[PDB]
Amino acid sequence: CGIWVRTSNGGHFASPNYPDSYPPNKECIYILEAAPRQRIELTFDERYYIEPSFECRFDHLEVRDGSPLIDRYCGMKSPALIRSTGRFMWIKFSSDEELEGLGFRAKYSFI
Amino acid sequence: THVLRFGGIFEYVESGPMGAEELAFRFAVNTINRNRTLLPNTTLTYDTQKINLYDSFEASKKACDQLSLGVAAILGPSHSSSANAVQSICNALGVPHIQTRWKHQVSDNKDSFYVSLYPDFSSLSRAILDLVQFFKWKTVTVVYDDSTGLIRLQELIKAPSRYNLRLKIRQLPADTKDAKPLLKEMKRGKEFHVIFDCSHEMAAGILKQALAMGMMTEYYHYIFTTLDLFALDVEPYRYSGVNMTGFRILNTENTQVSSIIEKWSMERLQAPPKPDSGLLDGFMTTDAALMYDAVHVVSVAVQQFPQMTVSSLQCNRHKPWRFGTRFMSLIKEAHWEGLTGRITFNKTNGLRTDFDLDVISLKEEGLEKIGTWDPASGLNMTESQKGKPANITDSLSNRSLIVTTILEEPYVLFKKSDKPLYGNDRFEGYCIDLLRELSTILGFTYEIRLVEDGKYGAQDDVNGQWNGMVREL
Amino acid sequence: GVAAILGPSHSSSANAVQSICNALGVPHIQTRWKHQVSDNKDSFYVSLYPDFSSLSRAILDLVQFFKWKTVTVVYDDSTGLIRLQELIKAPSRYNLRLKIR
Numbered sequence: 001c002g003i004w005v006r007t008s009n010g011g012h013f014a015s016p017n018y019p020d021s022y023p024p025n026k027e028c029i030y031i032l033e034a035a036p037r038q039r040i041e042l043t044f045d046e047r048y049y050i051e052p053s054f055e056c057r058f059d060h061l062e063v064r065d066g067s068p069l070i071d072r073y074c075g076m077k078s079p080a081l082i083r084s085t086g087r088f089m090w091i092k093f094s095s096d097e098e099l100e101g102l103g104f105r106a107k108y109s110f111i
Numbered sequence: 112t113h114v115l116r117f118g119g120i121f122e123y124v125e126s127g128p129m130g131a132e133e134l135a136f137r138f139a140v141n142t143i144n145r146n147r148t149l150l151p152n153t154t155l156t157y158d159t160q161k162i163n164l165y166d167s168f169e170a171s172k173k174a175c176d177q178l179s180l181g182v183a184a185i186l187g188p189s190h191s192s193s194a195n196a197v198q199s200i201c202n203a204l205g206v207p208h209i210q211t212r213w214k215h216q217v218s219d220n221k222d223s224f225y226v227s228l229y230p231d232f233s234s235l236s237r238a239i240l241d242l243v244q245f246f247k248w249k250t251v252t253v254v255y256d257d258s259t260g261l262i263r264l265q266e267l268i269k270a271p272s273r274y275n276l277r278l279k280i281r282q283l284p285a286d287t288k289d290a291k292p293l294l295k296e297m298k299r300g301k302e303f304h305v306i307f308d309c310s311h312e313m314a315a316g317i318l319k320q321a322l323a324m325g326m327m328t329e330y331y332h333y334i335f336t337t338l339d340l341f342a343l344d345v346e347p348y349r350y351s352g353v354n355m356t357g358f359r360i361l362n363t364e365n366t367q368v369s370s371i372i373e374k375w376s377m378e379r380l381q382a383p384p385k386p387d388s389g390l391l392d393g394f395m396t397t398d399a400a401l402m403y404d405a406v407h408v409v410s411v412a413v414q415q416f417p418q419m420t421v422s423s424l425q426c427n428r429h430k431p432w433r434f435g436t437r438f439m440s441l442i443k444e445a446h447w448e449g450l451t452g453r454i455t456f457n458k459t460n461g462l463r464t465d466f467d468l469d470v471i472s473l474k475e476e477g478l479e480k481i482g483t484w485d486p487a488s489g490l491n492m493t494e495s496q497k498g499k500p501a502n503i504t505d506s507l508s509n510r511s512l513i514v515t516t517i518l519e520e521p522y523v524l525f526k527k528s529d530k531p532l533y534g535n536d537r538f539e540g541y542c543i544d545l546l547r548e549l550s551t552i553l554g555f556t557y558e559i560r561l562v563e564d565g566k567y568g569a570q571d572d573v574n575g576q577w578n579g580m581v582r583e584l
Numbered sequence: 585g586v587a588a589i590l591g592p593s594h595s596s597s598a599n600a601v602q603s604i605c606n607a608l609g610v611p612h613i614q615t616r617w618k619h620q621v622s623d624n625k626d627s628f629y630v631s632l633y634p635d636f637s638s639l640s641r642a643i644l645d646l647v648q649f650f651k652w653k654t655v656t657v658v659y660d661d662s663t664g665l666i667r668l669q670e671l672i673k674a675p676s677r678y679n680l681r682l683k684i685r
């Protein structure tokens with residue numbers, strides 16, 4: 001399930017079956033790994049522009065720098081852009097048993 | 112044939128589709144017209160004005176209008192906002208007012224020219240309490256949609272201080288689909304007795320949700336305070352093995368009731384329904400039934416007040432109607448069999464506190480009666496178990512015994528065989544020898560089942576709940 | 585004619601004036617809190633009086649700061665319910681048991 005994107009200035013990152021709804025009962029961990037002095041650009045294109053729908057503690061998306069957990073988002077919002085200086089971005093996507101929805105898309109790039 | 116007119120007010124589609132209340136009212140006037148047993152010497156016409164929803168001034172002007180032509184009384188619009196306008200109009204100009212939809216009772220409104228055939232919320236809520244008390248639930252949960260549901264259940268809300276309970280309160284959000292995350296937390300909440308105060312349309316819009324998140328299993332039991340519990344799209348869900356429970360003053364026992372129901376059903380899908388919404392097409396709704404009854408009680412009074420006159424009054428000639436005194440009193444004092452059962456007015460709160468209620472529940476087939484309720488005694492709800500069916504006194508081994516067992520090396524084994532054999536013959540061992548011997552001694556019949564979790568069993572501290580053999584026992 | 589009007593104290597009676605001013609464009613101001621119906625589209629009305637919604641949030645904060653583990657709410661007439669619904673929804677979020685008389 002993990003989509004490793006090492007040593008690419010650009011590529012794409014999105015939920016499983018991304019145009020479709022995400023499969024349930026996933027637990028997939030993702031990495032953005034960069035060289036020293038190589039800065040990472042992380043970008044969320046929303047597939048669904050609204051203030052987040054299900055704001056709660058299941059089906060969260062964690063974001064990890066280095067691990068002080070920066071944040072967890074859920075429902076149907078985009079986090080704004082976050083600028084990487086730890087250069088090792090760790091992305092965890094979790095899925096529940098019974099809440100299945102539009103999923104998400106991302107864009108990573110090295111700067 | 113004394114001509115009379117009844118003011119008609121309908122917050123409606125403002126478009127082509129015609130509303131159910133207008134329909135039942137005209138159905139009512141026709142019913143008067145055909146059977147002269149009521150009013151042999153009298154026939155009443157009517158003026159039916161139509162307005163916008165939640166829009167006072169427009170209603171008030173229309174109120175002055177249906178004053179202009181003169182009636183005996185108005186029939187209230189089915190929403191409280193302009194309903195207050197209607198009422199502060201009626202008692203202001205003395206014409207009796209009849210309301211169908213529940214309004215927010217304003218504690219000190221000294222109006223006196225109004226009644227409401229609607230089952231007053233207090234009595235309903237008291238029955239709710241009696242019901243839940245009988246079912247011995249503790250972690251009940253209410254979900255409403257807007258404000259006034261809480262009021263409908265205030266008597267419920269105040270229960271805990273007298274009755275050992277708990278209940279959180281949860282809200283269906285602004286739009287209907289928004290209730291899915293609510294079901295999410297309730298799943299997290301694990302609240303297995305959730306009463307609902309909600310419009311049956313929303314009940315439908317949420318049952319798809321509940322089955323969709325699979326919440327409907329046999330443990331969960333919901334009770335729906337609404338009164339159009341009849342027209343639910345019941346059929347698929349009754350095999351989810353859920354209990355529902357609800358009320359219906361809407362009698363169906365009278366065959367006259369039925370006959371009128373099919374006459375309606377002919378005139379009803381006559382109006383284009385919404386089968387895509389998941390409602391059973393062809394069944395008249397509780398409100399429309401109420402407002403059918405209301406004309407009839409008006410009549411059953413008025414036939415004894417031929418001194419009825421219709422003063423063509425104006426809103427600015429502030430002197431009230433000439434004959435609102437005794438006529439309104441008559442309605443207060445009258446009694447009748449409408450389409451809901453015994454009809455009466457409290458004559459104290461100037462409303463209704465008395466009626467007859469059949470509690471109904473989702474059986475294996477659908478809506479089937481599970482009792483009766485009335486103000487005086489309260490709940491006489493009975494039970495489908497009576498007459499001791501298929502029961503023998505001092506019967507020996509009338510039912511067989513469900514014997515559990517564990518698989519162990521020298522204790523219980525499989526009779527080593529090649530062809531596929533089953534039943535209580537796969538299992539063979541020392542414990543089986545003991546079981547057979549003691550069953551021959553005590554003369555019983557037994558079936559064999561392995562424990563599924565497959566262990567002796569021990570107390571799991573995190574839930575204080577047994578496991579395996581002990582738990583299945 | 586007026587430049588505008590100040591509202592009467594009640595809720596119910598105030599409804600009518602609110603509507604009337606909307607029927608002619610008059611700006612209507614009010615003084616006491618009432619329950620707004622979520623299905624009125626009107627525009628020309630404002631309330632000085634602080635809403636009881638935010639008040640409930642503040643009360644809830646105060647409750648938690650004191651760290652109460654039991655409480656009773658008491659009102660006068662059922663309208664106080666609407667007035668407090670937000671707090672009344674305490675238990676879902678935090679560990680609060682509240683009762684009402």
Ligand SMILES: *[C@H]1O[C@H](CO)[C@@H](O[C@@H]2O[C@H](CO)[C@@H](O[C@@H]3O[C@H](CO)[C@@H](O)[C@H](O)[C@@H]3O)[C@H](O)[C@H]2NC(C)=O)[C@H](O)[C@H]1NC(C)=O
Nearest residue numbers: 233234237238240457458459460461462463464465486487
């Ligand atoms: C007109 O009369 C009716 C019927 O008496 C009033 O409704 C209320 O009815 C209940 C009985 O159903 C009366 O007793 C109450 O019983 C419940 C049982 O759960 C109990 O919890 C209450 O403490 C109370 O004992 C109740 O007294 C009665 N309310 C009143 C004020 O009489 C209706 O309210 C009457 N209207 C007026 C203005 O009197």
Ligand SMILES: *[C@@H]1O[C@H](CO)[C@@H](O)[C@H](O)[C@H]1NC(C)=O
Nearest residue numbers: 483485488489490491492493
């Ligand atoms: C309960 O119902 C039975 C049958 O109708 C009736 O005989 C009995 O009087 C009722 N009891 C109450 C409490 O009304």
